[PDB]
């Protein structure tokens, strides 16, 4: 009735989590460090010890909350992160290339897309989204209600995720306009929206009314933007304008032509960071959860602030919008009252964003030799096969495995977001060593046994994670319950093995789509990669990111290593 009928997130047994943790990490640390971690974990998990006390506190939390990890996970994964949102945090979804002969063709697309957003939001708010089922077991639908009603406020040390006549904000030439999408309570038609967008484009070209590019401030580090926003709110005009953005449905960004070839890689860059201030980088407001981009040259997609929802729900929404597209007072410019103080903040923010633009090493690589159909003919799940290929790619290029992240949905449970699948398994290590160590001369028949055992272990970890039995959320909650007892964390969580374990040098996810769109994001540590893939029946799309500052990583070398690994795995499956 009022209460969810879904199960609550399970609390795994303490000794199960501690044993999985040590087994996860043994091959990723030195023998001496492992020996010390074994003793730390034994003391933490001893009968009558601290771990048992924290586990009892966690079972009490599970009883008193809908979801015992929600608050800790939201803060740990998103709100505590100080990095600027572009590239480091906010993923982008790139739509098919569009062809816009005239400005009017760009605006008709934007009007059609806005109409689709209004229609989808009406379905959402009437609770008419058919409940998703696993692969079926019903799934939590609460992420859908965060697509349009969320705003991420910056804080000095921790951000705040806020839930809220309806309006969109249109960004054009770094200027922001309120576009009301109802008049006389009747939703604006696609034709009315077109008429309004034309007025906006005319107003935005006016030099005598041009305001400073305040959106650039949202692209900065979170504490930097917290400081600049605090300067802004000293003025009531700015407060009014910030309130309008905080309460909009979404942004629609009418970007300027990019001036570069519209390859998939280049369209993805424009969606990730707008190409910086000199291009479209200030035509943005990164705190708002959805920024649809409809560029004059046909580059279209959506930039996502992903603190309120994960990738499956986002793609369900965007696929619905795109498929739906197949079937009067003037807008109000938001005013700003700036100072030389704010001008200094703008210059700083432009410089910092340019460092992100220049630092990103990004490639879209389409593997075209095979995809899901071939993989399923090997009695393998496509996801597990591709995760083992990524381990082999990393090992053959960098000669070690590293802590690897892969999102696993826990939407089977109330308020469920994700837990981590740790794909750098002991079985993956045995396989990649056998493949790469030519001196060992392991027979191909044995390499194939090791391959299938690595895929089996990957599949098992995935089942463990999606059923709430993996370890990362459990350890996070024990850690934060310990911090509530005493600000000095116990040795368990100060141990260098634990800190290492959560620096995801390879950060991955599978985002399958049914249309030509694709998803991408940056790495999460300076010496890391981001790898987001889209498996299709006969192809697999890989979006690979890394940072040019890190001499070890290279996105083009990693994409080549992925190709070589998929070909090696094909050859082993063809003996
Ligand atoms: C480093 N990283 C970053 C993200 C994920 C998974 C979540 C996600 C992936 C791709 C698109 C998304 C669009 C909207 C919301 C979440 C999205 C995994 C690793
Ligand atoms: Na996790
Ligand atoms: Na690099």
In SS3 terms, 70-127 reads as HHHHHHHHHHCCCCCCECCCECEEECCCCCCCCHHHHHHHHHHHHHHHHHHHHHHHCC
301 and 398 fall within a common domain = no
Q: What is the CATH number of the domain that holds 339?
A: 3.30.559.70
Q: Which helix (H) or strand (E) holds 59?
A: helix 50-64
382 marked as binding residue: yes
The number of domains in the chain is 2
**C-alpha of residue 389 to centroid of ligand 2, in Å:** 22
* Residue 259 alpha carbon to ligand 1 centre in Å: 28
User: Which ligand ends up closest to the CA of 272?
Assistant: 1
Ligand 1 atom closest to 523 (CA)? 1
Half-sphere CA count of 431, side-chain side, radius 13 A: 30
306: annotated active-site residue? yes
From the alpha carbon of 520, which atom of ligand 1 is closest?
A: 10
The span from the CA of 431 to the CA of 216, in Å, is 47
Closest CA to 285 of 120, 202, 168, 166: 168
Torsion, CA 70, CA 75, CA 79, CA 80, rounded to 10:
-170
Strands 160-163 and 167-172 turn out to be unpaired
Q: Are residues 263 and 396 in the same domain?
A: no
User: Around 6, how many Cα atoms within 13 Å sit in the side-chain half-sphere?
Assistant: 24
Q: Whose CA is nearest to atom 17 of ligand 1?
A: 311
> Sign of the C-alpha dihedral, residues 15, 18, 19, 20?
positive
310 and 397 within one domain: no
Ligand nearest to the Cα of 546, by number: 3
Rounded Cα distance, 312 and 532, in Å: 13
Are residues 293 and 254 located together in one domain of the fold? Answer: yes
Both tokens assigned to 62:
């599970």
The C-alpha atoms of residue 533 and residue 387 are separated, in whole angstroms, by: 10
Report how far residue 408's alpha carbon sits from residue 419's, in angstroms, rounded to the nearest whole number: 5
What's this structure's resolution in Å? Answer: 1.6
CA dist list (Å): 217 to 84, 264, 336, 345, 354:
10, 27, 13, 7, 13
Residue of 552, 88, 486 lying closest to 286 (CA atoms): 88
CA distance 489 to 362: 38
The catalytic residue among 167, 306, 345, 398 is 306
Residues 431 and 442: their CA atoms lie apart, in Å, by 10
Alpha-carbon dihedral sign for residues 161, 165, 168, 174? negative
For the chain, the C-alpha Rg in angstroms (whole number) is 24
| Residue 160 DSSP code | E
170 with 254: CB under 8 angstroms? Answer: yes
Do 247 and 113 share a structural domain? yes
Note whether 547 and 553 are within 8 A (CB): yes
Q: Is 4 annotated as a binding residue?
A: no
**Cα separations in angstroms, 65 against 62, 68, 69, 221, 343:** 5, 6, 9, 32, 45
Q: Which ligand is nearest to the CA of 509?
A: 1
State yes or no: 553 annotated in a binding site.
no
Q: Under a CB-based contact definition with an 8 Å cutoff, are residues 508 and 49 in contact? A: no
Reduce the DSSP state of residue 543 to 3 states and report it.
strand
Residues with CB under 6 A from ligand 1: 91, 304, 306, 309-311, 314, 407, 507, 509, 511, 519, 521, 524, 530, 532
How many Cβ atoms from other residues are within 10 Å of residue 373's Cβ?
A: 11
In sequence order, what are the beta bridge partners of 294? 300
Residue 110 structure tokens: 């934007």
* Residue 56, C-beta contacts closer than 8 angstroms, at least 6 positions apart: none
Q: Which of 519, 540, 539 is nearest to 530 (CA)?
A: 519
What token pair was written down for 231?
Answer: 């300067």
> Residue 337: left if φ>0, alpha if ψ -120 to 50, beta else—which one?
beta
What burial letters (b/e) apply to 145-154, b meaning 16+ CB within 10 Å? bbbbbbbbbb
Q: Burial, 536: exposed, middle or buried (Cβ in 10 Å; 0-12, 13-18, 19+)?
A: middle
Return all residues near 64 (Cβ < 8 A) that are at least 6 apart: none
Cα–chain center distance at 436 = 32
Q: In what order do the strands lie in the sheet containing 418-420?
A: 360-367, 540-547, 529-535, 506-510, 404-409, 418-420
Q: Among 91, 143, 421, 534, which residue has the most ligand 1 atoms within 8 Å of its CB, making it the best to mutate?
A: 91
CA distances from 483 to 22, 419, 494 (A): 22, 21, 12
Q: Residues 336, 342, 344, 350: is their CA dihedral positive or negative?
A: negative
Cα-to-centroid distance, 500 and ligand 1 (Å): 22
Could you give the CA distance from residue 510 to residue 532 in angstroms, rounded to a whole number?
6
Q: Which atom of ligand 1 is nearest to the CA of 504?
A: 1
Q: How far is CA 196 from CA 173, 177, 181, 304, in A?
A: 16, 10, 10, 25
Q: Whose CA is nearest to atom 11 of ligand 1?
A: 311
Return the residue whose CA atom lies nearest to atom 1 of ligand 1.
507
CA distances from residue 519 to 155, 250, 297, 303, 390 in whole angstroms, order as listed: 28, 19, 20, 10, 17
Single out the residue in 314, 329, 363 at which a domain terminates.
Answer: 363
Residue that has been written with the tokens 């299709």 in this structure: 536
CA of 541 to the centre of ligand 3 (A): 21
Ligand 3 centroid–CA 452 distance in Å is: 32
370 and 359 housed in the same domain? no
Experiment used for this model: X-ray
Which token pair is 57? 């506190």
Residues 297, 298, 304, 310, Cα dihedral to 10°: -160
CA atoms within 13 A on the CB side of 53: 11
Is there a single domain that holds both residue 245 and residue 314? yes
Q: Are residues 522 and 399 in the same domain?
A: yes
**CA 402 to ligand 3 center in whole angstroms:** 16
**How far apart are the C-alpha atoms of 562 and 547, rounded to whole Å?**
18
Cα dist from 529 to 293, 361, 362, 393, 555, whole Å: 25, 9, 10, 12, 8
Residue 409 marked in a binding site? yes
Secondary structure string (H, E, C) spanning 361-389 = EEEEEEECCCCHHHHHCCCCCHHHHHHHH
Residue whose tokens read 């058919």: 130
Sign of CA dihedral 274, 280, 282, 288: negative
CA angle 136/137/141 to nearest 5° reads 110
Confirm or deny that 362 is annotated as ligand binding. Answer: no
Last residue of a domain, one of 363, 383, 404: 363
Distance of alpha carbon 572 from alpha carbon 555, whole angstroms: 26
Asked if 263 and 256 touch (Cβ cutoff 8 Å), the reply is no
SS3 547: strand
Same-domain status, 394 and 509: yes
* CATH number of domain containing 497: 3.30.559.10
Pairwise CA distance, residues 389 & 573, whole Å: 13
- What distance in Å separates the CA atoms of residue 232 and residue 490, rounded to the nearest whole number? 41
The residue range of the domain holding 62 is 1-66+364-575
For 468-485, b/e burial (b = at least 16 CB within 10 A) is bbbbbbbbbbbbbbbeee
The answer to whether the CB of 68 falls within 8 A of the CB of 62 is yes
Same domain (yes/no): 122, 211: yes
Query: What letters, b where the CB count within 10 A reaches 16 and e where it falls short, cover 325-335?
Result: eeeeeebbbbe
148 touches 250 (CB < 8 A)? yes
Kindly give the distance from the C-alpha atom of residue 249 to the centroid of ligand 1, in angstroms, as a whole number.
21
359 alpha carbon, closest ligand: 3
Q: What are the structure tokens assigned to 483, written together?
A: 């911090």
CA 536 to chain centre: 21
Closest CA to 478 of 180, 7, 72: 72
Q: Which atom of ligand 1 is nearest to the CA of 309?
A: 15
281 and 266 within one domain: yes
Three-state DSSP class for residue 524: coil
Q: Are strands 529-535 and 506-510 parallel, antiparallel or unpaired?
A: parallel
| Residue nearest (by alpha carbon) to ligand 1 atom 3 | 521
Q: Which of 325, 342, 363 is the last residue of a domain?
A: 363
Residue 527's Cβ-count burial label (10 Å; 0-12, 13-18, 19+) is: middle
Find out whether 98 is annotated in a ligand binding site: no
Which DSSP string do the residues of 304-358 spell out, in sequence order? E--SS--HHHHHHHHHHHHHHHH--PPPEEPP----HHHHHHHHHHHHHHHHHHH
* Local structure of 415: helix, strand or coil: coil
State whether 395 and 307 are in the same domain. Answer: no
Q: Which of 532, 533, 543, 546 to mutate to test the pocket of ligand 1 (most atoms within 8 A of CB)?
A: 532
List 290's β-bridge partners, or say none.
Answer: 304
375 marked among binding-site residues: yes
Q: How far apart are CA 209 and CA 98, in angstroms?
A: 31
């Amino acid at each position: 009735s009022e209460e969810s009928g879904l199960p609550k997130l399970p609390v795994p047994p303490l000794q199960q989590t501690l044993a999985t943790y040590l087994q996860c990490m043994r091959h990723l640390v030195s023998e001496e460090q492992f020996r010390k971690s074994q003793a730390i974990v034994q003391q933490f998990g001893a009968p009558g010890g601290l771990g048992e006390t924290l586990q009892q506190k966690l079972l009490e939390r599970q009883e008193k909350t809908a979801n015992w990890v929600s608050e800790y996970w939201l803060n740990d994964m998103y709100l505590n992160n100080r990095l600027a949102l572009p590239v480091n945090s906010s993923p982008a979804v790139i739509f098919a290339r569009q062809h816009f002969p005239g400005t009017d063709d760009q605006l008709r697309f934007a009007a059609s897309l806005i109409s689709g957003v209004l229609s989808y939001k009406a379905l959402l708010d009437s609770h008419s989204i058919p409940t998703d089922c696993a692969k079926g077991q019903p799934l939590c639908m609460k992420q859908y209600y965060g697509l349009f009603s969320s705003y991420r406020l910056p804080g000095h040390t921790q951000d705040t995720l806020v839930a809220q006549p309806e309006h969109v904000i249109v960004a054009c030439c770094n200027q922001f306009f309120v576009l009301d999408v109802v008049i006389n309570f009747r939703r604006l038609s696609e034709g009315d929206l077109f008429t309004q967008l034309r007025k906006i484009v005319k107003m935005a070209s006016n030099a005598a009314a041009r305001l400073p590019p305040i959106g650039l401030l949202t692209s900065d580090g979170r504490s930097e933007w917290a400081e600049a926003r605090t300067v802004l709110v000293k003025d009531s005009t700015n407060r009014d304008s910030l309130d309008m953005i905080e309460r909009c449905i979404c942004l629609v960004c009418l970007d300027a032509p990019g001036g570069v070839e519209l390859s998939d890689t280049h369209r993805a860059l424009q969606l990730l960071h707008g190409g910086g201030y000199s291009k479209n980088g200030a035509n943005r407001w990164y705190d708002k959860s959805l920024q649809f981009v409809v560029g004059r040259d046909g580059t279209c997609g959506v930039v996502c602030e992903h603190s309120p929802f994960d990738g499956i729900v986002l793609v369900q929404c965007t696929e619905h919008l795109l498929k739906h597209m197949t079937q009067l007072p003037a807008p109000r410019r938001l005013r700003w009252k700036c100072s030389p103080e704010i001008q200094g903040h703008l210059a700083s923010s432009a410089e910092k964003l340019q460092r992100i633009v220049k630092n990103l090493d990004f490639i879209v690589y389409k593997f075209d030799n095979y995809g899901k159909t071939f993989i399923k003919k090997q009695k393998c799940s496509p996801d597990a096969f591709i995760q083992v290929a990524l381990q082999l790619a990393f090992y053959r290029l960098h000669r070690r495995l590293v802590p690897t992240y892969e999102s696993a949905s826990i939407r089977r449970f109330q308020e469920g977001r994700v837990d981590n699948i740790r794909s750098a398994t002991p079985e993956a290590l045995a396989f990649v060593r056998a493949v790469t160590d030519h001196k060992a001369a392991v027979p191909a028949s044995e390499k194939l046994l090791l391959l299938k055992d690595a895929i089996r272990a990957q599949t098992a970890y995935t089942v463990m994670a999606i059923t709430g039995m993996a370890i990362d959320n459990h350890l996070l909650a024990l850690r934060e319950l310990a911090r509530a007892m005493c600000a000095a964390l116990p040795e368990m969580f100060m141990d260098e093995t634990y800190l290492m374990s959560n620096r995801f040098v390879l950060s991955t996810s599978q985002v399958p789509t049914t249309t030509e769109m694709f998803c991408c994001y940056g790495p999460v540590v300076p010496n890391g990669y981001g790898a987001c893939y889209n498996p299709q029946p006969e192809t697999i799309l890989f979006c690979i990111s890394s940072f040019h500052s890190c001499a070890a990583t290279s996105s083009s070398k990693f994409a080549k290593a992925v190709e070589e690994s998929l070909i090696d795995m094909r050859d082993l499956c063809s003996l």
